[PDB]
Amino acid sequence: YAWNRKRISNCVADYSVLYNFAPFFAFKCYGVSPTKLNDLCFTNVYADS
Amino acid sequence: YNYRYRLFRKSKLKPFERDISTEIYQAGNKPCNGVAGVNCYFPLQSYGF
């Protein structure tokens, strides 16, 4: 309910760290395949968690 | 929902080209076994009629 709106900007993304977690963890995506954001850029990222 | 369209493919289809290959694009060592999740996305989707 008080979800943290963590900002992600001015830094570089490391989606290769998104793996190695517990097996068969849900990894859904909408609007883009998860493996394409390495070749895509954005103004900001919200790391709500 | 009888009509279904091929949502995803490894490469773009050529002009006037038909592809009925239903082989899954397994991006990892995990076998899909029909499970939607990590490295496993179904290439076909039913029409939202």
Residues of B in contact with A26 (CB under 8 A): 37
Q: Distance (Å) from the C-alpha of residue B46 to the closest C-alpha of chain A?
A: 17
Cross-chain residue pair B38–A35, CB shorter than 8 Å:
no
* Whether B3 contacts B49, CB under 8 Å: yes
Residue the block writes with tokens 């076994």: B33
Contacts of B43 (CB under 8 A, 6+ apart): B6, B7, B8, B9, B22, B24, B25
| Contact at CB, B38 and A27, closer than 8 angstroms | yes
Reported resolution, Å: 3.2
Query: Which DSSP helix (H) or strand (E) runs through A28?
Result: none
Question: Using CA atoms in the order A3, A48, A28, A18, what is the torsion angle rounded to 10 degrees?
Answer: -130
- CA contacts within 13 A on the Cβ side of A11: 9
Of A35, B32, A21, A27, give the one whose Cα is nearest residue B40.
B32
Method underlying the structure: cryo-EM
DSSP sequence for B1-49: ---EEE---SSPPPTT-----------SSS--TT--BTTB--SEEE---
Please tell me the distance from the alpha carbon of residue B31 to that of residue B38, in angstroms, as a whole number.
Answer: 10
DSSP secondary-structure letter at A34?
T
Contact B27 A24 (CB under 8 A): no
Angstrom distance (rounded) from CA A39 to CA A32 = 11
